[PDB]
Amino acid sequence: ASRRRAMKSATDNADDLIKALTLAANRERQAQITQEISEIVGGANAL
Amino acid sequence: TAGRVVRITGPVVDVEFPRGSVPELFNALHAEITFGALAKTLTLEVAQHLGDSLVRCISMQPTDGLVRGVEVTDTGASISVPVGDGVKGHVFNALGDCLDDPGYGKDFEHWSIHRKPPAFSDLEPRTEMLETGLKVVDLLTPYVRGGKIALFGGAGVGKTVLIQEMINRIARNFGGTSVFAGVGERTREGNDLWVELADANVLKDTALVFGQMDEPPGTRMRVALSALTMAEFFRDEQGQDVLLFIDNIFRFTQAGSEVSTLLGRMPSAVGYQPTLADEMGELQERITSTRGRSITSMQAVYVPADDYTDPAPATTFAHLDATTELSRAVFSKGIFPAVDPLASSSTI
Amino acid sequence: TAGRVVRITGPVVDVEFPRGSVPELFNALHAEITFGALAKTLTLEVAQHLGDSLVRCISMQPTDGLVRGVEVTDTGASISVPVGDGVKGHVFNALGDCLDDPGYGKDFEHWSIHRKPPAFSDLEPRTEMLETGLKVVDLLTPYVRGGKIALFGGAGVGKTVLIQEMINRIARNFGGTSVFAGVGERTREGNDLWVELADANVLKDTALVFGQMDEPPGTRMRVALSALTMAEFFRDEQGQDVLLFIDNIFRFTQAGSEVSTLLGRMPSAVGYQPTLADEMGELQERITSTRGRSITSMQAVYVPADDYTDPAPATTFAHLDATTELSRAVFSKGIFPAVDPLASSSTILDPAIVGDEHYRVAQEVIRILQRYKDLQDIIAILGIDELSEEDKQLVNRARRIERFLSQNMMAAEQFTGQPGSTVPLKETIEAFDKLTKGEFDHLPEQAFFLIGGLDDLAKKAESL
Amino acid sequence: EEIGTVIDAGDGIAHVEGLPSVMTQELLEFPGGVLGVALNLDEHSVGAVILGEFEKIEEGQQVKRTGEVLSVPVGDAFLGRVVNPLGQPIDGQGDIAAETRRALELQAPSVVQRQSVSEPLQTGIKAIDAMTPIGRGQRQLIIGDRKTGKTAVCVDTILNQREAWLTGDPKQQVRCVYVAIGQKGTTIASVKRALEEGGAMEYTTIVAAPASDAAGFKWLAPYTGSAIGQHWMYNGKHVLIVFDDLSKQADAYRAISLLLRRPPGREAFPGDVFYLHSRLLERCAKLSDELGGGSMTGLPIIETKANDISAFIPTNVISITDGQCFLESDLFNQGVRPAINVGVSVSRVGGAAQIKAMKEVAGSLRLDLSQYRELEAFAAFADAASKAQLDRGARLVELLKQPQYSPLAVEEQVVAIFLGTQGHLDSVPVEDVQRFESELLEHVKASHSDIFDGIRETKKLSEEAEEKLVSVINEFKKGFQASDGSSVV
Amino acid sequence: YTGSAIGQHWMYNGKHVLIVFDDLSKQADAYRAISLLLRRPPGREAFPG
Amino acid sequence: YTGSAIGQHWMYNGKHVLIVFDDLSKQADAYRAISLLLRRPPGREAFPG
Amino acid sequence: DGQCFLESDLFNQGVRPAINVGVSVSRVGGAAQIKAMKEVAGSLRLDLSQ
Numbered sequence A: 001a002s003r004r005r006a007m008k009s010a011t012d013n014a015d016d017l018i019k020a021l022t023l024a025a026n027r028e029r030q031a032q033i034t035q036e037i038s039e040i041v042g043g044a045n046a047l
Numbered sequence B: 001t002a003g004r005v006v007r008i009t010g011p012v013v014d015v016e017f018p019r020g021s022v023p024e025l026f027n028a029l030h031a032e033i034t035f036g037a038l039a040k041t042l043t044l045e046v047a048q049h050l051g052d053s054l055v056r057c058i059s060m061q062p063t064d065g066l067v068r069g070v071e072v073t074d075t076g077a078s079i080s081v082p083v084g085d086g087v088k089g090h091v092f093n094a095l096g097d098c099l100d101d102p103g104y105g106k107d108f109e110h111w112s113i114h115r116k117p118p119a120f121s122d123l124e125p126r127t128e129m130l131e132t133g134l135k136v137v138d139l140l141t142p143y144v145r146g147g148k149i150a151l152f153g154g155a156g157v158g159k160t161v162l163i164q165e166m167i168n169r170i171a172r173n174f175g176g177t178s179v180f181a182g183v184g185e186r187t188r189e190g191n192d193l194w195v196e197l198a199d200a201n202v203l204k205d206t207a208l209v210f211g212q213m214d215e216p217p218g219t220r221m222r223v224a225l226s227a228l229t230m231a232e233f234f235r236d237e238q239g240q241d242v243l244l245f246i247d248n249i250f251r252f253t254q255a256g257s258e259v260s261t262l263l264g265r266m267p268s269a270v271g272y273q274p275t276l277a278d279e280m281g282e283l284q285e286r287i288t289s290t291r292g293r294s295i296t297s298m299q300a301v302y303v304p305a306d307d308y309t310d311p312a313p314a315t316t317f318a319h320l321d322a323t324t325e326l327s328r329a330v331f332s333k334g335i336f337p338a339v340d341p342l343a344s345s346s347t348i
Numbered sequence C: 001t002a003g004r005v006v007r008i009t010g011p012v013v014d015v016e017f018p019r020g021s022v023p024e025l026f027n028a029l030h031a032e033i034t035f036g037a038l039a040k041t042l043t044l045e046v047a048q049h050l051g052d053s054l055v056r057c058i059s060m061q062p063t064d065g066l067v068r069g070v071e072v073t074d075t076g077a078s079i080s081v082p083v084g085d086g087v088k089g090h091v092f093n094a095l096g097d098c099l100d101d102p103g104y105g106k107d108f109e110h111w112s113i114h115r116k117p118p119a120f121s122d123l124e125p126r127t128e129m130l131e132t133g134l135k136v137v138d139l140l141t142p143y144v145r146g147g148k149i150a151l152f153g154g155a156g157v158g159k160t161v162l163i164q165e166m167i168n169r170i171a172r173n174f175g176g177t178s179v180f181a182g183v184g185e186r187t188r189e190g191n192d193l194w195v196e197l198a199d200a201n202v203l204k205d206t207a208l209v210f211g212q213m214d215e216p217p218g219t220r221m222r223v224a225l226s227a228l229t230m231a232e233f234f235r236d237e238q239g240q241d242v243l244l245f246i247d248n249i250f251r252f253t254q255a256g257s258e259v260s261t262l263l264g265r266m267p268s269a270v271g272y273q274p275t276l277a278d279e280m281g282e283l284q285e286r287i288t289s290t291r292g293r294s295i296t297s298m299q300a301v302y303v304p305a306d307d308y309t310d311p312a313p314a315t316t317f318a319h320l321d322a323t324t325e326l327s328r329a330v331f332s333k334g335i336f337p338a339v340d341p342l343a344s345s346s347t348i349l350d351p352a353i354v355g356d357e358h359y360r361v362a363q364e365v366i367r368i369l370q371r372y373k374d375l376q377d378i379i380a381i382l383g384i385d386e387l388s389e390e391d392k393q394l395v396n397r398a399r400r401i402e403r404f405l406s407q408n409m410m411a412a413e414q415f416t417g418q419p420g421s422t423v424p425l426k427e428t429i430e431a432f433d434k435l436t437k438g439e440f441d442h443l444p445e446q447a448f449f450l451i452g453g454l455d456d457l458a459k460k461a462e463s464l
Numbered sequence D: 001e002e003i004g005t006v007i008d009a010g011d012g013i014a015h016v017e018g019l020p021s022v023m024t025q026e027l028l029e030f031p032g033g034v035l036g037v038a039l040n041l042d043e044h045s046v047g048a049v050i051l052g053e054f055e056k057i058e059e060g061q062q063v064k065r066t067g068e069v070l071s072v073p074v075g076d077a078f079l080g081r082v083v084n085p086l087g088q089p090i091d092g093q094g095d096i097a098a099e100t101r102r103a104l105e106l107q108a109p110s111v112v113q114r115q116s117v118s119e120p121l122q123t124g125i126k127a128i129d130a131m132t133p134i135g136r137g138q139r140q141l142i143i144g145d146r147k148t149g150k151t152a153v154c155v156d157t158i159l160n161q162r163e164a165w166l167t168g169d170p171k172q173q174v175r176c177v178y179v180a181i182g183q184k185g186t187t188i189a190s191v192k193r194a195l196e197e198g199g200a201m202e203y204t205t206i207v208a209a210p211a212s213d214a215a216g217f218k219w220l221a222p223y224t225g226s227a228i229g230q231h232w233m234y235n236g237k238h239v240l241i242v243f244d245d246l247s248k249q250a251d252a253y254r255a256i257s258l259l260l261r262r263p264p265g266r267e268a269f270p271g272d273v274f275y276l277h278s279r280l281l282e283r284c285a286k287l288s289d290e291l292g293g294g295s296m297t298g299l300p301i302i303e304t305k306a307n308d309i310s311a312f313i314p315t316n317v318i319s320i321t322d323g324q325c326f327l328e329s330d331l332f333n334q335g336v337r338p339a340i341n342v343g344v345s346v347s348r349v350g351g352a353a354q355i356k357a358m359k360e361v362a363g364s365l366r367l368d369l370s371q372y373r374e375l376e377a378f379a380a381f382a383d384a385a386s387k388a389q390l391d392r393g394a395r396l397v398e399l400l401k402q403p404q405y406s407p408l409a410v411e412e413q414v415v416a417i418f419l420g421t422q423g424h425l426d427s428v429p430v431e432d433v434q435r436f437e438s439e440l441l442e443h444v445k446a447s448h449s450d451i452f453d454g455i456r457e458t459k460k461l462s463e464e465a466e467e468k469l470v471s472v473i474n475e476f477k478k479g480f481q482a483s484d485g486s487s488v489v
Numbered sequence E, F: 001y002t003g004s005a006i007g008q009h010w011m012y013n014g015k016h017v018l019i020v021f022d023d024l025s026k027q028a029d030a031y032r033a034i035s036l037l038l039r040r041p042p043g044r045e046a047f048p049g
Numbered sequence G: 001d002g003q004c005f006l007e008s009d010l011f012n013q014g015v016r017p018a019i020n021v022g023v024s025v026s027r028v029g030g031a032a033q034i035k036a037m038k039e040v041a042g043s044l045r046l047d048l049s050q
């Protein structure tokens, strides 16, 4: 019984960690996209 | 009194005009291609004044075969579309030409598409719950007269059945009409939908407008504008409720961004035009409820890889009122009207 | 003799001069606004040359209501600050005139604000153990008498309370003259500080200079120079101990970035300007103590968007000798000092200077904290059951040490209403030695929370 | 007679030639009746950005100057009116006659002109007055995410001033200003109707900027929103102002800057946003006795995505402002309508201006709430003392729930706080608490209404009054019945 | 383009044709290069309009 | 460069030398700043060619 | 022709040199060393990495 309870708690602890990691990855990807597009447009219009 | 073409790079075109005759913004012009086998006429709209009698404009159909120094004429008025009680039961394009029968509707009455939303005083400080014969949706996610309803998750679970259900329900219970607009359409899907509707005997009391997926940018906005023009004409003069079906709200924004990039203005965060919010606000505030009449609407949306924080869905969700979800398990269980009650919610 | 304004695009102004009368690269010019509602007299500082007897300049006042073709005149010398003995006990702005009495201080002797740093020969390293009644600073990052100290913070992390604590701890017993500067803050704390020093009987000794966030960026780059001129005069001639307080240098960096963008120059990276490090070093190399003169300085810096990788704080980081950092996580944990031990360092921490007693205790403490931080992930995902006995006890005493490291504040009487305390160093050393050896295993965790001395901890032990 | 002509007509920007004598930020007239502002000058041309509608203007048009700096009309007739940011009556209710003009760009008072804040500003939401005291002249921040119910808080705060207005004392009367940037017209109509229902519309002025307009109005709304309050400042009155959302105008400023060809910074945001936000939030001040006194209490609202408090704009605003209040959508979905997280919400300046009776009727509820939170966190997987503590915490948490509108006054607020804090309702089941907490109050309004008089006069609770009300509630709990509730006896 | 042009002649004569494109990413790269060589405003990833 | 020149001069007479560089990142940033002040196009991540 | 990597984690851990044997190499290798050191030392780097 204790094993059942602990394993359930472990799953309920893992899911939200997955969600937070997904959010962080998404914001990082958006920041990267903005960074390279800004760099390329600046290099292009610097001429 | 007639201009000339100076630059022809890309879809964009630069036009030179005599002094004192430069057309205003959002004005129509015609230019005819007569060289080679591929002969046709093109329509252009004024996009920006460059000064010194130079006007930058965007084409509507491909600019292949054009020659420098050709002659061009201006209509003098904005893009016009024919409206009336006889326009239903016929397929139309963005420019108003009737694909089913050319020359149709030439004697109708034409209206412009750039129109102002109503005044502040005409707004009604009330929320009226729109009711229908479906007990599936009334108990959990009630609809709102004049609001917006989100629908996504088709996946071939029978959303066309829902569309025709709404069409016949508004035809019978409320004595209304229906207008369907396609922004990016696969030709086979549109043809199949037309055939199915013809077999269902509901082409009457239903107008259809299509914009093909393979088309130069510029149509993907004007199709929605024309559909809204027809819908508001039905609402006002006839004084009878209408329902607007608009699909593919997503690549409307992509077409706008594409045009903005073509004009050459600097982009914004995550590569978007800097004025998307104003355009989406104009389109959303186009519809409203007044004089006891209303325009409800159902829209299909597509999230960019499940990132709800992307600018496009974030801007879109600022105007929705209710969400409907199409599930792929309830119908496998045998429940023919497919919904996901747990995944659907309403603010009402 | 007289110039013409040719273009006004905001704070920056371009002016043309007749042949032979172009001014120097640093100078002051005057102009006037003749409109009835906003009549003023504005001062311009020359910034750069453009050829054809045309020069680009910045302004110290808002440019609203100005029209092209107005007349400008040249002073012939850089801007000046009224400096001398007795200016203490008053508040001033960037230009120099007193806020209370407009005519006060007009007769004093005036200096310049642009001065070369001292020669290399007179520089001399110094290491002295400054003492403040705080556990975290004494144990981990001891301060120095003649060095420069910095406080790195985020947003809403409690740094201002730390500044009030430091001024209360140090300014009481100081025999010298102190000086405070404000760069881009909000006036509420200005009034709070004024009224709090009014009844502290110390305002007579200190002079204040204020530049706030409501002013244009042009004025947000000069108050530091004015305060530095005051400190330089008090240090060079009178030969007295000098103390300096500076807040939000990051605002100075932001103002520099904005004015650079307005001037017109290709941005460097992450939307910044070239030669930021040159300006930073040029400012930071004047706060030095020679072999026969002394000066101490404490500064506050704000981390934008909680990004420690940003160039603006990264460049300034290698000009200090004792730094402290605050974290959002510890703030959420409930530790009000909110100092992270693993990201703060001091140069004088070595057995030669501090001694052999502190070194081993500090090393053991940092090792325990590092091990706990390493194991925290597996702790979070599953729990504490999977670990071995020794790791379990290490985690337990690591939690005890972390909770104990917080101390009851002195300036929190406005909020908590619980009087603070100060602790001698030897008591801290003995308490931490006992904690590392682990003689407080059976005590509950809640006792180790804002207690100060270990005697109060023993008293609170039976309170539960 | 100084007339110019347009050389180039961009989308949102125009360029005018000629017109030598023109002031900075001067107002320009166009043949279509639209107005522009000039911000960049040159030896050859002058740039300008158009306000309102711009599709009318085009190349070759005639331009005339007005000879006045950027200014807004202001008077005392604006009470109970609806207006656009420029200053024309948007509604057809009639015309407005002003008394003077006010420039938008005026410097804030210096450090010597300020004054400490000591006068409390009451609000109907009992869940924050006991939790996070507020005082007039002190700024506060409301931050959250979509669909959490914050405009309701704003309108309740606006509505709560009915008694103060009806008192008639000029020192007690408080005016109000409301602004709306990029909002749907239906919401504006609904909030106007709701204010009209409460009879508070006469002493309020609302500035409307719809979501379908150009960027200029979204940029200029806060300036003209605060100018009227600034004018009323120097006559000794007290002013309250609410900013519907600052993110939208920041986005509009980013759009106009990008249209003006300026290099960007972080996520295309220029570095000038901090300057303008600082200007707006520093215009407010608590004047001293020399100038006459007054207040400019402002309550801006900021929305966040997925509870991103570590973003750019939220951190900037948090740094600028004094305090903040946080709304959690997860708690909102649980039916807790006044969903404010006590964990991070805090005020620094508040507490001195709070009523002493209010300060002593609520005995450190913060530690009790945090203890209840940690206790339920521990008991999630799993002691009589702990059971009693969690029961008391549950009762206290459920007490703070409030229905829509119904702004409570100070007397019943402190009465309910005393009832909860003392330890009452321990035997009362939670399900029947709400109605109970109302009905008893109504009886107190009927019998023994003199108790409220003492609180109104001396602003403290006396021994005789408290024992009398204790006896009254002891004689009332037996008179109330529930499906599963019985008197403690 | 020439592959589809070849196929269309048979496809307009009641005959069934199957056409395979080995790759399309390289086509996009070639178009991007030829656009960048002359003056073309670049969007995301320097791709042309 | 001056340290390198001194080392070379002591090299060519047959001696042995050892040179220590404080940091190369700072001089790289100085080069970036001086190049960027001059009107030259920026390179990858703001570092010129 | 060779790199030495110092990480703050090892310095904190209690290793005063604070160098990791995983990613530290030398092109010349045993050629530079005196022969006696070459026989005494052996392949200690590989054993440490293992």
Ligand SMILES: Nc1ncnc2c1ncn2[C@@H]1O[C@H](COP(=O)(O)OP(=O)(O)OP(=O)(O)O)[C@@H](O)[C@H]1O
Binding pocket: B347, D145, D146, D147, D148, D149, D150, D151, D152, D337, D338, D402, D403, D404, D405
């Ligand atoms: N105290 C309350 N009692 C009852 N209902 C409430 C209460 N507070 C909020 N609500 C309900 O919650 C919703 C609040 O909508 P509201 O317009 O205030 O949203 P919001 O979070 O301010 O966001 P937005 O500005 O996007 O609309 C409404 O449906 C309202 O009826």
Ligand SMILES: Nc1ncnc2c1ncn2[C@@H]1O[C@H](COP(=O)(O)OP(=O)(O)O)[C@@H](O)[C@H]1O
Binding pocket: C154, C155, C156, C157, C158, C159, C160, C161, C336, C337, C409, C412, C415, C416, D318, D319, D320, D346, D347, D348
């Ligand atoms: N030791 C403490 N005791 C009580 N409150 C504290 C303490 N430290 C910080 N705070 C809280 O943190 C806030 C400090 O904000 P702060 O970080 O100084 O703002 P800013 O960064 O703008 O200067 C105060 O409102 C205060 O309530």
Ligand SMILES: [Mg+2]
Binding pocket: C156, C157, C158, C159, C160, C161
């Ligand atoms: Mg702080």
Ligand SMILES: [Mg+2]
Binding pocket: D147, D148, D149, D150, D151, D152
């Ligand atoms: Mg709302």
